């Protein structure tokens, strides 16, 4: 059974990740999101614990969906003859971090700090589960506005985490690191930290720093809004040209700008309910 268990609503959107619909689970009105993808269009595949051929995305979501976290969890999935259907958590009410920033402009540092910490935990969770997301960006982060909680989405560019080099990538070019641009080579964590540097700038300035390849490889970070010296230093650290000069997750979360983070409910009361 599929269209019995889940009542399907309006299309939420569609693109490189397939077609995603609003839905409600009928056994308990749980809000969900239903994501379809054609087998013809899947570029990457894996094998489940059952040992079955599945899109890599299912493999990765299953590894990170154990326990609670800052990731949007996979509740279920069906295979169809020409497609796969994934049933996913949906917060309600929700807005993605890309629209939130467009509507509100550059975020206050205290709020940027709360969001960015939550994204850092969510990514740490992924890495601990052997998953590398490879498309961290504002558009792949949802805000649960009531709870003040950020959740990661879209594992369709992801890979298994490994310590050797990656020579394939197909996430968002503007969040991709200079060693991808110049050599079609990168290592997982160091690339992730670059993306997070781009994300932090996006949060505190209102937009990403670089649009063009030449800008990505030049690593000159002009700040277009007032941003504290501590935050500027963290961002420039994340955006070091040489991968090995970038900070680890630990150095980031121990950086002085990162201290005294608000709790998620505090973040909601102060910055989201009003």
């Amino acid at each position: 059974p599929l269209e019995s268990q889940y009542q399907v609503g309006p299309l939420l959107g569609s693109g490189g990740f397939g077609s995603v619909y609003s839905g409600i689970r009928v056994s308990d009105n749980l809000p969900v999101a239903i994501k379809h993808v054609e087998k013809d269009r899947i570029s990457d595949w894996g094998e489940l614990p059952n040992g079955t051929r599945v899109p890599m995305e299912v493999v990765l979501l299953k590894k990170v969906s154990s326990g609670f976290s800052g990731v949007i969890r996979l509740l279920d999935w069906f295979e169809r003859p020409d497609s796969f259907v994934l049933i996913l958590e949906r917060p309600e009410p929700v807005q993605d971090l890309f629209d939130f920033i467009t509507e509100r402009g550059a975020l206050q540092e205290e709020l940027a700090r709360s969001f960015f910490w939550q994204v850092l935990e969510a990514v740490r969770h992924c890495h601990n589960c052997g998953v590398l997301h490879r498309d961290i960006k504002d558009e792949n982060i949802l805000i649960d506005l009531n709870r003040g909680e950020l959740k990661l989405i879209d594992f369709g560019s992801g890979a298994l985490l490994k310590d050797t080099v990656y020579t394939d990538f197909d996430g968002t070019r503007v969040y991709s690191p200079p060693e991808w641009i110049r050599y079609h080579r990168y290592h997982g964590r160091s690339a992730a930290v670059w993306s997070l540097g781009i994300l932090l700038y996006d949060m505190v300035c209102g937009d990403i720093p670089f649009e063009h390849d030449e800008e990505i490889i030049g690593g000159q970070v002009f700040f277009r809004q007032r941003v504290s010296s501590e935050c500027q230093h963290l961002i420039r650290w994340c955006l070091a040209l040489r991968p090995s000069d970038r900070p680890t997750f630990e150095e980031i979360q121990n950086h002085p700008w990162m201290q005294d983070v608000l709790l998620p409910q505090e973040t909601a009361e102060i910055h989201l309910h009003s």
Partner: peptide
């Protein structure tokens, strides 16, 4: 000129 960026 702010905008989304697909994969």
């Amino acid at each position: 000129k702010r905008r989304r960026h697909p994969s």
